[PDB]
């Protein structure tokens, strides 16, 4: 028999390509107000249907690093946040001299914040009145290059102008579903042991992705998804000692955080009809902010991670260590929860090391004991470079507490020397793409090419 | 079986149930301008493919065999091994080189038969 | 008679002059982004209905009778009393429940015809 | 009286507050139905309806 | 500053008080401006007080 040309439409064929995925969220947020929360101010009500579908005979090379969804998530969150700061007050009257008092305590320890006064312009342009506010030290810098023990400045006003966060909006990470327009499909890996790049022998298709948490943290990956059956170590290239290595845990480690001080809300009219906020007197006794982690659980976590860091470094030691250094934003485990920006020192979480000896995990002497991380709090924040980089976070009155689950680590392997066999890992700060890359790893977008051509046994009946 | 439910099924088993994959190519929901872009882009893609099908004479689409003969230099492969036990997604990676050639012939053949649709009807 | 000029007329009298109502479904004139959204929404709606008609095999639309047999449990009403002296707007409030069932059958019947359009043409 | 509450704007001198009449109407695929019975209570059926 | 005989194409050296990073502290400063962009300020006679 002969063979001619025939055309089919509606064929399953794929090619991966760029596309802007639109954000969706569950319907309960869509009765809310403007800018509260961003998850509803710029998204659409999601639908659980259609449910996940599995492709019964497939092979597609997913890639966690050569991916463009994280780029879109970065761009969208920057633009969304920069839009969210527009209706807020911009604090330009606060670029004034601050005269501060020098209360002091000696012996033991103390955690004071300064009490600084400053002339303010009231509702009347040409009439002023004396005032005061309490500020944490990191946001206060001495003004004059000449010696003066009392005249200070806000750390801004040398760099760009600087804005207060609106009091009606929140930083709460409401989950987000990214999903594709018509003519595109989201392909989902479903093999639990997936290295991150290379083929998935089990591949699926979904309408909209699982709820991602736009949550910010540097050294510890907070509330999020958990691994399937074991810890997975994932890096773009493990022959490179500079690249960020992502460790995604199986079991979570619970962490509680608290600021015990019973702070007070103080308000200040600054110009016609807008109010600057500040902390008044501290009620009760002054105490230290901190976060607690159970010690045996951390030993178990770091030991299980050590078992898999030695799948690539078998003979050698793993030797965890302190952050390398740098500025306060680079070294600390910065996070926001409860509305106040914490910056916790992590040096006690990485003080010893699994030495190949997998020391016995049970029976624990006292599992209720914990290891405490001391923390410092800021009000002026530089969240990302260039996106209206200030946000003055208005203080929250009262004492606050926060409870969350650890789910992953960002680490880094230090530079070797002298052919050292005992080489060391460390916590790693990184760009936020690294943070979200731990969550969008499962997904890739494909275009549908529904037109195909084939040989067939029929001819057109002309 | 859903949207891509026949992906990986045999080309014979995947050549049916085409409508469920044809019915999904048109939809829409927007925030902002940059997703309205995607919406009109998808509408444009659908209309482009429909216009291409019409230019070949396969309007009222879905399956439509034709007259542009299968030159052996396009496949050089056996009919059973390509239809019974190959899949469309991996059939593309065997014929993707040569579709763009076939489309032009497949237009001019429509022209060549519509000429007869003109002439023979005029003479009758 | 205009746009909805046959609204309220008999189903027989309203089954004609369908073009004047089919011709008004496409138009546009916009200020701002929200009316542009309305415009593309209308275009999408028209294309969705056209694609649905094509999936049933009623391309070149307007009136198109079929094979999917009228199950008696859909109407149970006399032909004269429904065609001569009912109007379409209040016919919907007698059959609105059961159209969504009929559409899937009306797709798969077209599939079951396209199978023969393939097979019998191949054998000839 | 302001400056205790929000800041406050002068009306542009070129623009006017004159109520020029406005015609609202619908995009394609929608129709406007008009009641034409003069005694209409406001809600309930209109026996005379127009487009 | 002035020159006589021949020709001269000079531009003015004008000082002006400026608000620094601190709103309520100011410092003395100067810049050279071409004359077309510099106009005398007061309608009354003054040989030194100018405006943009
Ligand atoms: C931060 O510093 C400010 C001043 O720089 C402190 O506010 C001042 O507090 C004192 C003590 O209460 C006030 O003076 C008192 O006023 C009462 C009037 O009932 C009088 O009887 C006392 O003899 C005494 O003069 C003072 O008015 C007040 N200043 C202002 C501008 O309100 C503030 O307490 C300091 N806060 C901390 C946490 O150190
Ligand atoms: C402010 O501090 C008080 C006292 O430390 C907290 O009160 C305790 O809260 C825990 C839960 O976090 C309860 O189990 C206790 O029963 C509470 N009382 C005491 C005496 O401990 C209070 O929770 C803190 N505020 C916030 C917002 O966390």
Numbering used by the authors:
A (entry chain A): 32 to 139, 150 to 185, 185a, 185b, 186 to 309, 312 to 321, 321c, 322 to 354, ...
B (entry chain B), C (entry chain L): 520 to 547, 569 to 664
D (entry chain K): 194 to 244
E (entry chain F): 134 to 139, 150 to 185, 185a, 185b, 186 to 193
Could you share sentences copied from the article?
The upper path from I2 leads to the I1 intermediate and then onto the mature DH270.4 and DH270.5 antibodies. Mutations in this I1 subclade were generally further from the antibody-antigen interactive surface with less clear structural impacts. In DH270.4, a VH S85R mutation is positioned for interaction with the N156-glycan. However, as was the case for the I1 intermediate mutations, this region is poorly resolved and the interaction cannot, therefore, be confirmed. Autologous viruses that were resistant to the mature DH270.4 were predominantly enriched for the D325N substitution, but also had loss of glycans at 301, 332, and/or 442.
The HIV-1 Env is a trimer of gp120-gp41 heterodimers that are heavily shielded from the host immune systems by N-linked glycosylation and further protected from neutralization by conformational masking and considerable sequence variability. A glycosylated region near the base of the third variable loop (V3) of HIV-1 Env forms a supersite of vulnerability that is targeted by antibodies originating from diverse germline genes in multiple HIV-1 infected individuals. Here, we determine structures of antibodies in complex with HIV-1 Envelope for all observed members and ancestral states of the broadly neutralizing HIV-1 V3-glycan targeting DH270 antibody clonal B cell lineage. Here we used cryo-EM to visualize the interactions of a complete inferred DH270 clonal tree with the co-evolving virus Env.
